[PDB]
């Protein structure tokens, strides 16, 4: 309890900017979640040896996919602690707690694949969820683990708390499935510029939590541009593979997934950063004006796509 995780100097700065790329060692990433989960929540928040316990099983279940593994897991959980801090005052005891775990969790036992090839593949998590296929397997996923022994984190809290933080989890991690976004981000719209948005109405903080879950989500494109350009290329390896897959079930894929169609890439991100990434950190900011960094760096991405397609590079 005395027993504060720190991290070197250059680190300890960085981690509290929205850009912070956690960098290349694994073996750090653990305590780097632990000290935002404490800096967050608190030293209190979590049992240490059941909170550690959790973390490693979490990592065993991510799988080893050129994107949606380990690493992308607590990137997303550092883009959403770097929102939290920025947003003090905010958030509830619980929220603190349940959205850097549900963050680490999204994207549980991940294959590489999107809902859609799964829905051709006709595979058996798509008889058992109809709908955000993945997100209902990854909050699955995200209770199993919490039910090993010696891994409840949440053991201190009631009945009632535990019912409220899962639940918390649960709406987090549905969420990120990306075909939720867009009504939810243009709902969000309306309430905010009609001024009917209350965040004392729990139906709306949902609302405000998964634009921040997506925000998170989506937030390689608010990283330093060589940053922002290396992911790009996880990205890509990962839709092609896919798109290779849709091949041989007999289905020519979207060319975003085409690998035949690597000469469009630049022109798909202009259209991923122009429909998708600036009206979501656009709405976000506009509800939590100190994540505007968020939409800063996305905006000067958006820029040097743009140079990309002119060859100035
Ligand atoms: C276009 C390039 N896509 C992307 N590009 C980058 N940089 N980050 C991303 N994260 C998720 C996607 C993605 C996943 C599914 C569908 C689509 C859509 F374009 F249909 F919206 C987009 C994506
Ligand atoms: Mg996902
Ligand atoms: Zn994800």
Same mark, same amino acid.
């Given at each position: 309890?005395?027993?504060?995780?720190?991290?070197?100097?250059?680190?300890?700065?960085?981690?509290?900017?929205?850009?912070?790329?956690? @960098?290349?060692?694994?073996?750090?990433?653990?305590?780097?979640?632990?000290?935002?989960?404490?800096?967050?929540?608190?030293?209190?928040?979590?049992?240490?040896?059941?909170?550690?316990?959790?973390?490693?099983?979490?990592?065993?279940?991510?799988?080893?996919?050129?994107?949606?593994?380990?690493?992308?897991?607590?990137?997303? +959980?550092?883009?959403?602690?770097?929102?939290?801090?920025?947003?003090? /005052?905010?958030? /509830?005891?619980?929220?603190?707690?349940?959205?850097?775990?549900?963050?680490?969790?999204?994207?549980?036992?991940?294959?590489?694949?999107?809902?859609?090839?799964?829905?051709?593949?006709?595979?058996?998590? +798509?008889?058992?969820?109809?709908?955000?296929?993945?997100?209902?397997?990854?909050?699955?996923?995200?209770?199993?683990?919490?039910?090993?022994?010696?891994?409840?984190?949440?053991?201190?809290?009631?009945?009632?708390?535990?019912?409220?933080?899962?639940?918390?989890?649960?709406? +987090?991690?549905? +969420?990120?499935?990306?075909?939720?976004?867009? @009504?939810?981000?243009?709902?969000?719209?309306?309430?905010?510029?009609?001024?009917?948005?209350?965040?004392?109405?729990?139906?709306?903080?949902?609302?405000?939590?998964?634009?921040?879950?997506?925000?998170?989500?989506?937030?390689?494109?608010?990283?330093?541009?060589?940053?922002?350009?290396?992911?790009?290329?996880?990205?890509?390896?990962?839709?092609?593979?896919?798109?290779?897959?849709?091949?041989?079930?007999?289905?020519?894929?979207?060319?975003?997934?085409?690998?035949?169609?690597?000469?469009?890439?630049?022109? @798909?991100?202009?259209?991923?950063?122009?429909?998708?990434?600036?009206?979501?950190?656009?709405?976000?900011?506009?509800?939590?004006?100190?994540?505007?960094?968020?939409?800063?760096?996305?905006?000067?991405?958006?820029?040097?796509?743009?140079?990309?397609?002119?060859?100035?590079?």
């Amino acid at each position: 309890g005395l027993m504060q995780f720190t991290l070197p100097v250059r680190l300890c700065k960085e981690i509290e900017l929205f850009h912070f790329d956690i @960098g290349p060692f694994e073996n750090m990433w653990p305590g780097i979640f632990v000290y935002m989960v404490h800096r967050s929540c608190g030293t209190s928040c979590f049992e240490l040896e059941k909170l550690c316990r959790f973390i490693m099983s979490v990592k065993k279940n991510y799988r080893r996919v050129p994107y949606h593994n380990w690493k992308h897991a607590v990137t997303v +959980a550092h883009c959403m602690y770097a929102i939290l801090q920025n947003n003090h /005052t905010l958030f /509830t005891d619980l929220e603190r707690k349940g959205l850097l775990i549900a963050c680490l969790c999204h994207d549980l036992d991940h294959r590489g694949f999107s809902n859609s090839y799964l829905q051709k593949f006709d595979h058996p998590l +798509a008889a058992l969820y109809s709908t955000s296929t993945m997100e209902q397997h990854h909050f699955s996923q995200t209770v199993s683990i919490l039910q090993l022994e010696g891994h409840n984190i949440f053991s201190t809290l009631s009945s009632s708390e535990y019912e409220q933080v899962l639940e918390i989890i649960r709406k +987090a991690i549905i +969420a990120t499935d990306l075909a939720l976004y867009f @009504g939810n981000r243009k709902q969000l719209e309306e309430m905010y510029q009609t001024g009917s948005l209350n965040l004392n109405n729990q139906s709306h903080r949902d609302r405000v939590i998964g634009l921040m879950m997506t925000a998170c989500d989506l937030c390689s494109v608010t990283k330093l541009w060589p940053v922002t350009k290396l992911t790009a290329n996880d990205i890509y390896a990962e839709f092609w593979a896919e798109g290779d897959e849709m091949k041989k079930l007999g289905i020519q894929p979207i060319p975003m997934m085409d690998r035949d169609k690597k000469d469009e890439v630049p022109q @798909g991100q202009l259209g991923f950063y122009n429909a998708v990434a600036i009206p979501c950190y656009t709405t976000l900011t506009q509800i939590l004006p100190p994540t505007e960094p968020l939409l800063k760096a996305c905006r000067d991405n958006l820029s040097q796509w743009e140079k990309v397609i002119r060859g100035e590079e």
